[model samples]
Target chain A: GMEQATRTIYSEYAAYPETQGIIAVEKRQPRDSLTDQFDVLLLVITRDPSVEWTVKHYRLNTLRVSLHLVHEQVLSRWLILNANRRAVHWVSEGTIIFERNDYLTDLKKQLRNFPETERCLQMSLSFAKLLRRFQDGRNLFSRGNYYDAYTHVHHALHHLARLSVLEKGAHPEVVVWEQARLDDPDVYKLYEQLLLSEETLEQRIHLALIGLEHLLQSKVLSGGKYLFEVMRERDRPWTMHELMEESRLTELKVDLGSLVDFFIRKGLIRISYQRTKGLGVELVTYEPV
Target chain B: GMEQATRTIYSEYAAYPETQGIIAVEKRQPRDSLTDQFDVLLLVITRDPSVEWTVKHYRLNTLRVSLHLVHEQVLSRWLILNANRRAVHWVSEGTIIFERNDYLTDLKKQLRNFPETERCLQMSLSFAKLLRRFQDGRNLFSRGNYYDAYTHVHHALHHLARLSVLEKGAHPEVVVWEQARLDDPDVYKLYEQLLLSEETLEQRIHLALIGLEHLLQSKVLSGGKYLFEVMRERDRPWTMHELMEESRLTELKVDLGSLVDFFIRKGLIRISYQRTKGLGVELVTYEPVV
Candidate 1:
């Protein structure tokens, strides 16, 4: 009869009339260690439309709750970003309590409708990031950290699998390797070399690094094609930092410098310097051709 | 005179008897440009002691102000962390309006006092972050982007210089590289190798990275032993920012930036920022980087 304890909370909050809708997971999969004492999320969609958030922590034993009061539009924004992967996955994987409005049905549809351009951006940034990891692996190998170098190559392969699966617009599950093998058998062979073959860790890592680089060199552009397209919309030059700050282009903000360089060498972008006559200062500018 | 516009603000706000002290700087420096409609930071020391924070925006025909209503305790915390540079500089460099209490006097002393323990933590973290940026620069060169990669190594050098200045609890500001170059001319030679010298961009980054790793392994840790001894004095896990003061190695440079990241290669620390959703953006409180 812990209606003596847990029931007080479930009944009181559940019966509150203004709740727009409430959903529950098929199983309450604990996200972290503190979940038993406090549940961080209780997808409570209140009727308020303007978004301002505040968090409060309670040490009150057993009745502990981590309320994330969210505006409905923010849910839509996350869907648009195709981000907060766990939350999005939680919605599709959850069971419902009850609803007072069409909000729950409508929000569910928006989650699956990711923008085509955003999908392309994620894949592009992911590919470039994966390549950098591979390069780091090789660098580590040379630095004589053989065991650590092997792991970097291992992660690069993981990203390659993710890139291949992401292009098809499928959710690469937590355990992605099993699914990725079917999508890219060519890369899967490299994974086999890294994992199964009777070769030194260095030899295996190098083979995968070189093989994937050849197979997906064009993927670097395919992944980045959307970025250049956006940059091309305006003829005026932008500082690399300026482009990185755009909300739409936020995905590639971390590793954009190298891609811009790759594009300039490929004649995809033009660089010019605008100099002032008397000031004696040189300014570097990058623009589309 | 522009002083008239600025003076009216001081006269009205300083007139309040509740304020323990009011400090005003001659000019406002823009730090993060994203806030334009919101500018002109007001350093008000309110009489209230309770923890409450608010940001308000307004426009008067000739004067605009975005008042940051912070208590005295928060100002002390900011100085201890050595963060909010424009705000820190605001108090130190400002012309004093009036001092009702010794509150402002006590705070100024706290600003000049950079604890020795935090200095060791700062130098340790700065070297790691600079190493990462340098490595990224080298990788970019291999990926066929020469100019961008060079800029990364160039920026890493700038950070290295900032690290040196922070060692002495000085704000690095904009001219740190030249200051750092003067202090450590041997390491400063990497700038020539990477920038003006005849070596290829890739070759230059390679040489600089090797030299940096060697210098860090040799000089940085040995010089920092004295500060680390100071940390053993307080036997508690240091708050991410509290531990990460400006470096004290008298030259150079965590997890407010990733504690785990700073030492994961050596498995010394594992860290995470306690993040909670705030409307649209994430509010992260970095776990104390031990």
Candidate 2:
């Protein structure tokens, strides 16, 4: 299939300039309009003489049939309609052939170099994890989890799109996950990882979570301890006592009094002091920022 | 024409909610799709009263001729579309009417206090001057003379679009000019002189040349001194010897050993040296950057 496809592409390139008369103008025009218009007729003849039943039934044969069918049906019609249009006039038949050949060659090259099973699977899992996180109120970029978000999304799109092309045996040029234009380093890294790693979904998700946790701990939430710490071990609502104990000052002391006062002023934290506990009793549960 | 227009706007604002059938929706479909759709409709009408005129003349008049033109033409269609789709809906017709009235009052007050002749002339002449400057290859934000060849073509389209609006009495909300944004003291001074001085074309040209000369002397074009200097005096070319004399620098101080070498290095500049009879000197003229 590959060899036959390659040969077809080469032949198309050689005959491109001459094909313009049929593709560029005559094909694009209405049948009545095409009657008097100047046109070029380009034809491709199969030269493989020693074809047997096995060869005729091959995957490459399907591709060759499809390509020829497209050339005759889709491209031929498009050429006739677009031939004399103002926008398409300057674009010649040869340029279109060269562009298509170049596109095909690039696509084939990308498909040949796509990552193996393990890496592609890992990227898919990481992307699903990120989407789940997005469903929550947290933003990937704003939460300083940009790198993870970038990588997961970038790799997921690239690997998934490439896999689709490869599985379908369609022109690989249809996949357009070019990373040079992506500005986010985190996303770029994920793209690199997808192209490099052999990690599984369980492995990638564990790694992604570890990185996310490290990022949260290093950055304080609303000038206090991390929000994750306030959540119960099972990720449930915090009781008042549990919240107070978690917020208790240590050597690196934070002014809990002033912090509470600030939150009260902003109408974020409500105060409900009770005599049953003492002066600083009935401490309100710290809510998520 | 102005008085009648002002009256129509005031009338629209006074009973806008009721006339547009907004009041009916508020009472019945309080939380329906019809109510939600009216918010966008009211917003459009508030910003531009022409929308009300368009609706009244084209769509509403065919259905019914009454104050409820806004409701019949604008809000009813939105409500029907939204109701069919089953979307969340909440429209505040009274609030929109209040806002529209506030804007109308402000517009009316401005029109009442408008300086008739001076304001009109200033706006018209300023627009004309802007169009002319744009045609001459000056960009609205960037100030370099060496623009991409497509700059003028883009500017022409922009100015023509603006002029079309201005001709129809739609004033631009903001002034876009390269000189207007510049904060450089030298550039500012020249800009002020250009705006304030009622000088002859030659005098204005001379003053502009002097500004460029000052820019050159300040080494503003340090990266491309020769080109800048030559372009600054493109209308009046000078030989190396003449430049040396004018700048009060010796032949060696000019630093360029050979005119041919300078011209060869910078293909942008073409040199044609001539022998002056009796004086026995080299004379060369430089063309401006294309």
Candidate 3:
């Protein structure tokens, strides 16, 4: 329906054909005398699409659409900078464009701060500790042996939001927008209610920490035995009694049979029956291979 | 029996008015009456031990002993550097003493590398990787994926041994003596039979890695939920059915109850029971505190 939009724009600027770059056209509306009006758009596709085909086809197209909306501001700046007689009124439009450019540039730079392994590690570790503390019925937010309840709750909220910020490309614009919404009276009331509520705070903090613990554990186990190992001297298998003694953990907490079963399930340790002093006993050993 | 031998030399030197630094004493044994009859007992305590009480007494004593040995070497060199010139022989001793002075001076200028946090971290990581790989039946000297294995093992051995060397004050003579013992045929036979055995290697590697891992994990978990909370948002909760659906894992192998139980035990997950539309069922979630 709007296929003739590019042709219309090109025909209008036929006198300055050499001055124009590749004009991409989009239709604003179909022609109607009463309430509808037709508009032709002209856009320059600056970079070649072949090298980074995905960027060209997807990102460049999105950028072009954005540029089309802001073309008036761009042209106003151009007119103010290079016009025969300098127009003071158009200078304000140029300033607006300059400010927007600066904002976009700063946003791009901030986005680079995302995807840091160190931050992820730190965040993950924090989350794990929180979950453990919370589960222990320890007052995470109250002033206690190390940290106060307020600090704990504040810290969880801060980091949880920071993680989201990192994942969302560290865009300052997005952060500002979110912050503004958070600062709104009604929104702040709801936010305070949810975050300050003891039950809700505990639940959300627990959830966040559990998620982080999984990540940290996954990372530690990524390289397999490179992160940890178990061994016994002289190919000696660990007996149930021997394992209990060596581990030094409570029998109720750690059932040797269950541990062996778990390890067998995980393909970490194997158990076999062996005759020791003419008595049959289970011999458990690590099967790293 | 030889405790009083040095005492007799001290008394003899004390009585002799002409005797200065050189004190002659009798040998402990009578193997050859002519050649091994007497021994020179030099009584050169250059500095009084009580002069610097604030300085570490043992370190000061070690320094004194080191200086005495170096002076002895200088005296031996003096006899050789001026063998042809009697007039210059005295000058040679003086020159050797001057060189010895320079040696001590330069010793202070030499850079000493201390084991810092980075070194500790590197050693821990390398040792952990090495022990893990060794336990996995990975060749420590092989290439490809095992290149890191070889490097880590070699580095762990070198660093652990070097830590001992540093503790021993990097004494050249002592290091040489220890190296000679390690290189001995009998020592090599014993080492090959025991220390280099697969079982022994695995045990030692595992112990080292365990110690290092404990150190790192302790440091990481020091501030409660602060570090753990940072990792909380990576994954949302998955139901038992959802996990099977998403991962294509068997229910027998990856049972929801067992999986949740394991994770809860490992401090990786928190389980909760919630009523969904009056249907009470258990739900599991992950939480990071940081």
Candidate 4:
């Protein structure tokens, strides 16, 4: 009955030439949790950006269903940002109902494969965020804000966990820590110590900072290899503006400045300036070291 | 010389009619940390969105300066999301070098004021996010993934801290726990116990779950007031599509469905169904508890 009703709804979108694909997803591990209001979810991928709209709900009395209209462009963002973690799970696991040119199958394969460039970018983004959180946490620790510092260290550890998971050639899913625990116990132990140890919050964070410092130092080069590869493409040094233009680095825009600062501090990047019109001013640029 | 050099850079953007304001900022408490390469920072607010660009760096021989060109729309988002935490500190503390018509002044005042509507939306967004974290945390805890559960609980607690700070009529700054510690000791105590207590991680999470359940129960009504006000504007029960259109609720879009579910479960909202063309089918709509 659920499939029949979903098919009825599918027919509505299937009529449109612009509807690229439609996939139906069921609740994950239905026995693991209480049932949701929706019996099924339909992810409709469309060719036209204008057709993309917010989540739509449909009720067939007891057979409730929800639908999401996503443009291919928007779907690509979700694929990279992983902002909608559920959407990833849905697209990967859902049963395809219709397709225009096997686009959904190819996209699904890409997601399953987790391409090297994509994984590299993901690691870089995680490293950028982790660096910020780690710096803030260390700074807060210095200020004796143990509670605040502890929160940040916890956050940094999560990023570390994600980075570890990424390193193992898998995308970090929604339950990242669980995934990390299974694949990488070294990082998980660090997280466990912070959470479960009897040490004072300050001591825990202090130890974590030390541990993090070492981990970051070791991974710093590999963590930034994605950006490094980009820099190597051009002999001319890059201004922050030029690096920001790379679509692959788009997700890192917000943290790019701080990331660059960290990279420079680590001797991973060098800065050079070109003379400007003013008597003393010059335009600053960056180069991979 | 730093000021003199900054003035020269200021003059470049000052000539443009589309430039609404320019503020020059200095590093935060320079002595507390190692000095950055930049000697000064310029926040240039522009009227034209096309002029906006990423961070631009200029070095005046030994003096270094960085500039950000931001459109008013993007600035408004930064103001609300507080994603660029340093930007907030910059706008409030920076020395205004130029202004077209006091736009920067009023914006500074608003940042200081933390208006009720804005705070309400912030709290709602925090609450929405917190709900997701708490739900995920509780589920993980139930599934015996204590480590993951603890992380989610930590995130959820941060949101609670933000919500508590918002309740105290102030925007939660970058250092939220510190703000909560000073303003709301009760919440701070809950956080402290989870971190400082020598209990097992599971015990700490369990205690937090109980505490969060109570806090969510009490604060649930106030937390949803922003959304409530929007729902009340139309007596006709609102659909998910209709409510998502409210610009005020834009930030809550990601967590909105879960928030609605939480509200319904708490009996704060009621669901009504409108008949669709299909047999045994209806569209789900929501209403505040009558």
Candidate 5:
């Protein structure tokens, strides 16, 4: 009924050359703890970036409608970053009204299949955030900011949780830890210990810090496949400048310096110095071991 | 020594009409687990948006330099959203080499001051994130996914921590909980309780959700000042489309429907229905209560 109503409201968009797909996601359940808000969510995905967010509201008879006009790139970025969290639910559950070239069908299938390329990039992204949080946490711990360190470590664990799920070749759902706990017990045990341990909060944070480093060291090989593969494409060593220039690196959003430094420290990658024009000055270059 | 070296390497950029400022941040601390990796970081803030992310590397007389050419708008977005977290530290700790019209000085001062506009917007962003996580957590819990619910609730608490710090008239640092604990005990207490409570994990998540709802209810007014102010600008109610068209709303990264639904439920805002062309059809419009 909702989809039928939505079609009537958004029927004109179907004829537009720029329009790719239209999906209608209806709110069925009551607000069981802020589950889903809208009575009907109309997602109009288009190739046109300029119409990325043409939101509209309408009431047809008794139906409440909230329409979202989003660009395909915008939708893709959200899927990668998991930014607008609810959009995923809407996309997966929504009824498709209009799809050109089976765009929505293909997108839905890809999500369900959870292919390697998507998993690789998503895991790589998660790894970067994990590295960042763990680094921040450890630094804070060293500085005697135990409370703050605890928070960062907690976040780091959450990222690890996401990585754990991705490693098992599954999409980390909005409530990721559920999937993570079952997918990888080792990481979940660490999270449990951190949360439920009888030790002091400071002790727990420090313990997690140690665990995080070990996890990072082991996971870097697999989690960093995207980065490592990019580096491996070339036989010669890569300067920081050369590495950052990779389109994949930009998409990864990983801090190249920090990741490279970690890889160097772990002996997973070796660095060579090329003497520059300036006397005694050397440019650092990286190559995977 | 590093700053002087960095100045020489980047001095050419100063003459560029597009360059706004150049600052250098040197890594003084050892890698006690991934602390500031670059030896010398040079930040080139520019007026040209096209050159926002011009990163380059140089080695000058034993100094390893990483130069970042960023636009003013890009830098401002980083400041607002706290994305590219290290950029904030670089901008603050960095030594100025060249600045056009004291831009870096003013920026550093504004950060120190932590004015209301920044706080209001930051808090609004944080609140949206919090609402998102809390909602996700509770939904997961209801579905018997306690583990995932725990994680989402944990994130919600983290967002609350950010909001707590913002409420205290300070920029939430990289390690936000440090500031939040000292600034807002009420929120930190909930976080600690959630983490340390002897109750079952399910119960703890449920308790936190209830606490979150209360926090959201109380925080909505002040945290939503940006949205409310925009809505209050005119005497008439705002259609959903009109409300979303506001520049501030786009910057918010919030789901308009989610925020509006919560606001209406809480009686913070009143909604009216306008009859559409079809019989019994009504479009929803909102107005803040005076």
Candidate 6:
């Protein structure tokens, strides 16, 4: 009878041409803490004329049900945009109850295989963001902007945890203390000390700074190597400005700065810049050494 | 000696001239909807840099008494930006444990009567913003953008919660489902069903949109009623620039286009545009229909 539930929901809108396809999904791991009602996710694909994502929770007489009607594009775009982090779990973990056509099938295949280049960029960028936040938090604390300092330190760690997940080629979620606890206990321990420690505010903040500083220093070589290898392998010179233009490419540049700085220090990569000849304007060339 | 709180928290701070006041707060109604820790808020207003707001837990013998050493400027600024919603209730409801010279005594005078026009404008705008989001979500739903619809509907509800609290002249928390549930159960009921029920995504969304529509329409009459009354009392056409120039607004740039449309719909006000005396430039005028 539960099998018929998909048909009941889908068949009503099946006539429209824009109704491209629908894939049924049951939660692979149900959160046991909440209501007993089971929620289903439908990877629904419609053309330009369709809803983005919506959830409904009601009862079919006795069966408590929740259905997440996701737009096809939303699912695919979030593959890169990360608008939906649970997407990896859903697309990778759940069973497809129904598929209307090839589009859904293609998406399923795409989701299961996280692209290597994307993973590298996401991982590096997240790590850089963590360090930037830490530096900002460190500066904030020194100024006795304790409230903002507290916020920034927590932020750095939030990004750190996300970086940890992204490093593992896993999607990062917003509330990461739980995920970090499960995935990397050392990271989770830092989280614990930051939140639960009885040390004075400055002392507590200093401890977090120590963790992130060492963490960033430790990561410098490996992240640099990986990025430099990518640049060399492609035989491409990607200036920061050129690369950051596309939002798609912008995320890759976040951590790339430190890597570039590191590489330049070690003489791992050559540095060069050029002036684009314009009608009249200017000459400001800084291709980091 | 157990649970005998010290008034020393206030007296020691009162030594400093910058310390305007200290208000002792009670966790009279700790929200179970959020974090479990029952933290006390002290509305300590100091004019200068001093003890910053921080938390301490589980080590009093180690002299680890938890405290919030708020700056006076920060507290005053929170009047509109709402530094923390709990601060509103704390400063509003909590007892003034101590006052410093003329500083704290003067602040106590201003605390009782929170500004009226700002809040009315804030509440009304939230209603419009809520409806704007709902309409966007409604458009997304019609176009079959289910994901966008989901996010927009959720945003609509966020504004709706803020609107409900603002209507009551109560400051709403950033995480407000708890307080909204208490003050306006109808909106809370909808929020609950959206988060926890057997309603389908499509079904729940439509329900929320319908509710927001009605809510927004109803609020326009009440919320706009005050602004309209102000105009009629002055019997002068109000220009957007004059009020904001009066230094009453920062985030508020009221879209009188919609307000004027609403007044016309309800037959409460007439709108017209007039040419400047020399420039021949048209300026819109709104005069109450009464």
Best by DockQ: 4
Q: What is the lDDT of residue A136 in candidate 2?
A: 23
Pairs of colliding residues, candidate 5: none
- Model 2 C-alpha lDDT versus the unseen true structure: 0.31
User: Weakest 10 consecutive residues, lDDT, candidate 3 chain B?
Assistant: B53-62
Evaluated on chain A only, model 6 obtains a TM-score of 0.70
Candidate 5 lDDT, B1-290, residue by residue in tens: 65567666777899898888888876777542212455777889998856657566667666667778788988888887666657877778878888899899988887676556767877788888898888888878989988778878888888898888888777777777767778988898988888778888788889999998888787887667878887888899988888878887787634666777777877878988898654555678999887
Candidate 3 stretches greater than 4 Å from native: A1-119, A122-147, A167-191, A194-289, B1-290
lDDT of 6 at A3: 58
lDDT of each: 0.55, 0.31, 0.30, 0.80, 0.78, 0.58
Docking tier of model 5: it is medium
**lDDT per residue (tens digit) for residues B151-170 in model 4:** 88889889999988888887
Q: Looking at candidate 6, what is the lDDT of residue B97?
A: 72
- Could you say which candidate leads in lDDT? 4
Model 2: per-residue lDDT, tens digit, A16-83? 44222112122344221121111212222122232110100001222211111123223322332222
Candidate RMSDs in Å, in order, are 15.6, 31.4, 33.5, 2.4, 2.8, 20.3
Candidate 3 lDDT, A153-185, residue by residue in tens? 333333333333323333222132254234333
lDDT per residue (tens digit) for residues A81-104 in model 5: 566656787778878888999999
Q: Write candidate 3's Cα lDDT for B91-146 as tens digits.
A: 22211222223442342233233223223323223233323333222333222323
lDDT of 2 by residue, B43-141 (tens): 223323434322111012111111122323444334322221211122332223333335433433443342433233323333333333343333311
Question: Quick one: RMSD of model 2?
Answer: 31.4
Determine which window of 10 residues in candidate 2 chain A has minimal summed lDDT. A51-60
* Model 2 spans with C-alpha error above 4 angstroms: A1-176, A179-186, A189-289, B1-12, B15-49, B52-290
Residues A57-118 of candidate 6 have per-residue lDDT tens digits of 33343343444555766666677756555565666655555555666567668876768666
TM-score of chain B of each: 0.61, 0.20, 0.21, 0.91, 0.91, 0.64
DockQ each candidate and list the results. 0.03, 0.01, 0.01, 0.66, 0.55, 0.02
Error (Å) of candidate 4 at residue A2 is 4.5
Chain A only: TM-score of every candidate? Answer: 0.75, 0.20, 0.23, 0.91, 0.90, 0.70
